[PDB]
Amino acid sequence: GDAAKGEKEFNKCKTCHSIIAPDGTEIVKGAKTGPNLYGVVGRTAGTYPEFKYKDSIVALGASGFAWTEEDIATYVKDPGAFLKEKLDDKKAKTEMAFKLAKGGEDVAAYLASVVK
């Protein structure tokens, strides 16, 4: 997708998320009520240290799942529907209460390029 446009679309994510490199460099200074999204491409779902996730997203990483750009793009359009489908569980719940109407792919490409 497009990284430069996804950078501008991350203005919907920064209200709960930041993007902080391991030495502390703040690539995006945002909030702290969602987890750090630096290196989230390729990382096991629900394992970022010192963050209390809801149980479904943890069970999703406990089965082997690591995020990809394409899964980020779909999850961000409707996080609770994503979780219900992958876990095959109607009761799957999510704490991320925000659905991105368009721009999933671009934000996803922007998150992969930020470590690079």
Ligand code: HEM
């Ligand atoms: C399009 C913008 C956003 C993107 C790209 C995004 C991306 C993500 C991703 C990729 C995860 C899973 C992280 C992991 O497994 O470590 C996540 C989790 C989460 N996000 Fe977002 N997020 C966005 C907007 C938001 C907003 C606006 C909020 C708050 C209103 C939010 C709150 C959270 C929370 C609380 C979690 C943990 C989910 C859980 O425990 O169920 N996110 N987000």
